[PDB]
Paper text:
Y-family DNA polymerase κ (Pol κ) can replicate damaged DNA templates to rescue stalled replication forks. In this work, we present cryo-EM reconstructions of full-length human Pol κ bound to a primer/template (P/T) DNA substrate, an incoming nucleotide, and wild-type PCNA (wt-PCNA) or PCNA mono-ubiquitylated at K164 (Ub-PCNA), at resolutions between ~3.4 and ~6.4 Å. The structures of the complexes with either wt-PCNA or Ub-PCNA are very similar and show the Pol κ core docked to one PCNA protomer through the internal PIP-box adjacent to the PAD.
We reconstituted the Pol κ−DNA−wt-PCNA complex by mixing purified recombinant Pol κ, PCNA, a (25/38) P/T DNA substrate containing a dideoxy chain terminator in the primer strand, and dTTP as the incoming nucleotide. The complex was separated by micro-size exclusion chromatography, vitrified and imaged by cryo-EM. We obtained a reconstruction of the complex at a global resolution of 3.4 Å. The structure has approximate dimensions of 127.7 × 88.0 × 89.1 Å, and displays the catalytic core of Pol κ sitting on top of the front face of PCNA in a remarkably angled orientation, with the axis of DNA in the catalytic cleft tilted by ~47° relative to the normal of the PCNA ring plane. The duplex DNA emerging from the catalytic core threads through the PCNA ring hole and bends by ~30° to avoid clashing with the ring inner rim. The long region C-terminal to the PAD (residues 535−870) is invisible in the map, suggesting it is flexible, in agreement with the disorder prediction. The PIP-box acquires the canonical 3.10 helix conformation and docks to the PCNA groove via a three-fork plug made of side chains of Ile529, Phe532 and Leu533, while Gln526 binds in the so-called “Q-pocket”. Thus, the folding and concomitant insertion of the PAD C-terminus between the PAD and PCNA creates a composite interface burying a total of 733 Å2, and bends Pol κ core over the bound PCNA protomer, causing the bending of DNA threading the PCNA pore. The triphosphate of dTTP inserts between the palm and fingers domain and its position is locked by hydrogen bonding with Tyr111, Arg144 and Lys328, three conserved residues among Y-family polymerases.
Residue numbers in the entry:
A (entry chain D): 1 to 106, 109 to 186, 191 to 255
B (entry chain A): 45 to 224, 282 to 408, 412 to 534
C (entry chain B): 1 to 106, 109 to 185, 191 to 255
D (entry chain C): 1 to 188, 191 to 255
DNA sequence: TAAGCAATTCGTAATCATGGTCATAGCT
DNA sequence: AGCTATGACCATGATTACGAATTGC
């Protein structure tokens, strides 16, 4: 009998506004320590991994491990009905095919029910390794950058060095070069550079990554060589939302 | 007879007869006034076609004589006076000329023909030998023209419009070969082909038919005229192309098969003169490219000057399946073997199209295009298991009873699109 | 020479933007009682009843009793040309087929001379019933409840008991079962006689709730098997009532 | 070489926003006096003219009077990648195929260098010489955008008449002639609609273009219109004392 | 119990890029 | 609460993809 009371409703609205454009279905693992999500999209280019652990929920309880497949556009149509303040009470029984959302306004107690499905997402992820360049930057600027090179081309060149990091794109209308130079309290640019690494990615996934922008204001880009780019947002006191993307050539 | 195969060709017979009646209902609703503007337009375009009917070249087609059987016969000296059959008890590739008259043909099962001849042998082929005996012949063919165009492993369009003029000032031992010197071949256009056939004969210990024509489609049928170990020739003059274009069935031309035969038995066509006598009928009835093909096969027109890969598939048939795990596991072997064969040419495909066949014989080609270029045995299988998933679970209480699965990498990229090769994520995951 | 001068010019704007979606042409009955309209939609289910009294028109003058047919799309596209702080002067004559409008601004007047038409009028009366339940709820909360319920299905089952008013629906995913309990111009008041459970269709209530910016609060008026009233009261001008019929 | 730094980095995000659906290729005569542009549009009736002179720039150097053939749609797709309060520097070599844009934020940590591939065309420098007018009308900008977006729901032609006491924007249609009447202002911020005149004006214009011409409305807060007989309407915008942007459109029949 | 590859043809239909509209919110 | 920004939702050709059918070797 999974049961989860979240006193800040806009966290769940923001998460499933982030994940509905890139992937379109998910298979949530809900176990005794939090909610986990592991999903690669259709083209098998990106991966999205998500953990919200069982401590920033204002109440959480679960008695047996559940696997819950969810159409994310159906859940993003149901969760469009809460306001920005509804205490959201997701309940779900174990062997029933419906997830009962119960909103609660701060007595307008809605009660929505959704159908699940049988989805078998792949039960594998990137093993734990070490990374070479770890930039940490303001996430409004990262979203502005990933939405400011798609007007040029569909290839971004992230060239990372010690003084800063440079984003360049070259397409049929020309080319462009944005250079980040390191800092002098959350406009802070910290570059844990080791080896200067130059890579190239697809912007049609970097624009879908930047739809978790109001989930934080600090984003960590973690790169290496022959290894996917990591973009990470931290949902405050809750957990994280990571995006892995594969490079070109 | 009354087989499942008979049932599906019965349904296909119903469908082609339904299209026969759907054509005859559109055939009656034209008049003698609807045979005017279309006829004038297609014969104005035929005036634009036939005025520049350029045939200064001499295109040679060179078939073989029961190729898959003959290359076995150059490597089996025991039974040269016997009828041989390649394939097995499901399908025949091609059988030899000591069995063609008896009925043992191509596209015929291993049980239909074998009940006709109780004294026969049916031996599965060796597909590695023919790829070498093709190249041995291609060594001889490259000398007379460097730009020869081998369609299959045996057919070979050659252009000898330039080699013949540069042969006139030759001595009588450059134009003379030895039996494996032997008889000197002359400088005529028949003689260059006699030389080619003699070299392919006493350099592969075999025989080879031939055919000389001013065009390609004429060569394809002249190669069938005097067929076993023989040849033929047409002269390049616009009268002499007409005397052979008559009195020909359309069971002979390539591009007019079996169903476009029966859809022309309706309108009273056997010879190509009758096929010419229905300009405004066939121009209004059939589709655009098909009436193009009919109007250019009528006057005998086509390729006057001769000219990479676009697909790569693996299909596989088997007995009746009714389980759920066996389809998912057997798609992986077909993903793997195709991933082996995809890297030998080093090609990056970006489409997987699975293709399933019921036990009562319906095709189901389910396609899926990705943006990651696909090469390896695990970057395919995660594009085809999500199509086996969509078409196993759409029969919600019932299994799939298949007999053939097959994968097909397609859409191989250019030089403009191989410098931006996006990669899959399944190379990196674990 | 009919003249009707209204000083809060946003009233007619919110009304006609709530009417131009549903019905196409309609009849304006112009009398000493004020401005009247009863019309049906183009699918003959909903019944629009607009009543404007003469007390709060800042100057009224209506000698004869006129009837003016208007196409509401053209009238509303003229009623997207004035600010929310203007003085409307509606005008008509018997010597012309032109409904004149003048928008006065506190130095940009806006003259319009719209065409009328001539429709074949239908004066259908509403027999007044004694309603089983009349609820009063703030207008925005009802607009939110219908507009968020429209994504779930189309069959809204409005239920009512003295403790609570209970909207249900259904659809291809599951029933969005909204409640509202018994509870300061933003309260919910339930006048109940017998408990009600009655079906309606949301795809016209969505056309109804675009009169939300008229009043702060709406009143629903219901009886068993009688078509319901959804009433949006302009303060001290009249009301705008919508009638919908239950299904099955 | 040519390099030009400009501190108001929003003006090129608005000058090159009022000119992306109207025209699609133009001739930036980059010379010692400053950036110009002249372009009749894709229908060859409306004459855009634009001038950013030298003294309003932060810094500015060039001596080779060059003439860059600039594609305005792609250039606006690049200038829509800058912040509002940035600082914009233009860079060009002499025989250059490309042109470099520098977006420096005042936060100074992020700097942007875009590079745009040019083309080459020749445009008509159809010179507009010194004229004298009849009526001038100096008015708010949101008001003019509101007036034209009102009258474009009624009809699709506009009679504009100017007399001593003000202006009439009269727009007939299929559903009844709209009419909006504006008067002057005596002793009052932006509300002043100052209308001066030597002889009255009744001209007539179309409304497919006055929903394009007042796309320049965030560039200023007062537009001016000028009119006379047998001379086109002059729709003038001023920029932050760097120069101006004129649109020209002719009367009808 | 009736293959195994490849190539091509047309008509269906899925996805995408496009501008327009609407709602909610930061700024006035 | 209006102005403007701007992101969600939606119409919609349109290129691109899908699929059965047909032809060859
Ligand atoms: C027609 C056909 C040929 N083949 C193979 C077998 C043949 O040895 C080879 C050549 O095709 P063909 O050259 O047309 O046939 P053939 O040479 O065997 O007989 P002929 O000389 O009378 O034309 O290709 C098939 O596998 N399947 C088929 O349907």
């Amino acid at each position: 009998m999974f049961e989860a009371r979240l006193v800040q409703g806009s966290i769940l609205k923001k998460v499933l506004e982030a994940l509905k454009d890139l992937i379109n279905e998910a298979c949530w693992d809900i176990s005794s320590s939090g909610v986990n999500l592991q999903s690669m999209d259709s083209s098998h280019v990106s991966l999205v991994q998500l953990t919200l652990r069982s401590e920033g929920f204002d109440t959480y309880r679960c008695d047996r491990n559940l696997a819950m497949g969810v159409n994310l556009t159906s859940m993003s149509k149901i969760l469009k009905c809460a306001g920005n303040e509804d205490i959201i009470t997701l309940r779900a029984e174990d062997n029933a095919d419906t997830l009962a959302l119960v909103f609660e306004a701060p007595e307008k107690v809605s009660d929505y029910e959704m159908k699940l499905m049988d989805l078998d997402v792949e039960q594998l992820g990137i093993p734990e390794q070490e990374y070479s360049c770890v930039v940490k930057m303001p996430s409004g600027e990262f979203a502005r950058i990933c939405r400011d090179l798609s007007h040029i081309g569909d290839a971004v060149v992230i060239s990372c060095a010690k003084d800063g990091v440079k984003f360049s794109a070259s397409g049929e209308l020309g080319n462009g070069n944005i250079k980040l130079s390191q800092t002098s309290e959350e406009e802070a640019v910290t570059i844990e550079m080791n080896e200067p690494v130059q890579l190239t990615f697809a912007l049609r996934y970097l624009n879908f990554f930047t739809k978790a922008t109001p989930l934080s204001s600090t984003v960590t880009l973690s790169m290496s060589a022959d290894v996917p780019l990591v973009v990470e947002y931290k949902i405050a006191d809750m957990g994280h939302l990571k995006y892995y993307l594969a490079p070109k050539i | 007879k009354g087989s499942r195969f008979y049932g599906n060709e019965l349904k296909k017979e119903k469908q082609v007869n339904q299209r026969i009646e759907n054509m005859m209902q559109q055939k009656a609703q034209i008049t003698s006034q609807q045979l005017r503007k279309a006829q004038l337009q297609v014969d104005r375009f035929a005036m634009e076609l036939e005025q520049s009917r350029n045939l200064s070249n001499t295109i040679v087609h060179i078939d073989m004589d029961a190729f898959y059987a003959a290359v076995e016969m150059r490597d089996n000296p025991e039974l040269k006076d016997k009828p041989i059959a390649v394939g097995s008890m499901s399908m025949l590739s091609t059988s030899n000329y000591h069995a063609r008259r008896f009925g043992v043909r191509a596209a015929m099962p291993g049980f239909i023909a074998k009940r006709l001849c109780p004294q026969l042998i049916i031996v599965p082929p060796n597909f590695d030998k023919y790829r070498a005996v093709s190249k041995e012949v291609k060594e001889i063919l490259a000398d007379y023209d460097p730009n020869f165009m081998a369609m299959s492993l045996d057919e070979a369009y050659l252009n000898i419009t330039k080699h013949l003029e540069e042969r006139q000032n030759w001595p009588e031992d450059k134009r003379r070969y030895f039996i494996k010197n032997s008889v000197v071949f002359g400088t005529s256009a028949q003689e260059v082909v006699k030389e080619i056939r003699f070299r392919i004969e006493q350099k592969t210990t075999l025989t080879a038919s031939a055919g000389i024509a001013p065009n390609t489609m004429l060569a394809k049928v002249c190669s069938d005229k005097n067929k076993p170990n023989g040849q033929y020739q047409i002269l390049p003059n616009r009268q002499a192309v007409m005397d052979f274009i008559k009195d020909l069935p359309i069971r002979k031309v390539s591009g007019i098969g079996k169903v476009t035969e029966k859809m022309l038995k309706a309108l009273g066509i056997i010879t190509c003169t009758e096929l010419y006598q229905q300009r405004a009928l066939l121009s209004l009835l059939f589709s655009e490219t098909s009436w193009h093909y009919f109007l250019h096969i009528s006057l005998g027109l086509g390729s006057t000057h001769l000219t990479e890969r676009k697909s790569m598939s693996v299909e596989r048939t088997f007995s009746e399946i009714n389980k759920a795990e066996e389809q998912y596991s057997l798609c992986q072997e077909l993903c793997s073997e195709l991933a082996q064969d995809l890297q030998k040419e080093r090609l990056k495909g970006r489409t997987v199209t699975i293709k399933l066949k019921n036990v009562n014989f319906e095709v189901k080609t389910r396609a899926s295009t990705v943006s990651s270029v696909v090469s390896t045995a695990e970057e395919i299988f995660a594009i085809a298991k999500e199509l086996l998933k969509t078409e196993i679970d759409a029969d919600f209480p019932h299994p799939l009873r298949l007999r053939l699965m097959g994968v097909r990498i397609s859409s191989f990229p250019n030089e403009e699109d191989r410098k931006h090769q996006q990669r899959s994520i399944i190379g990196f995951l674990q």
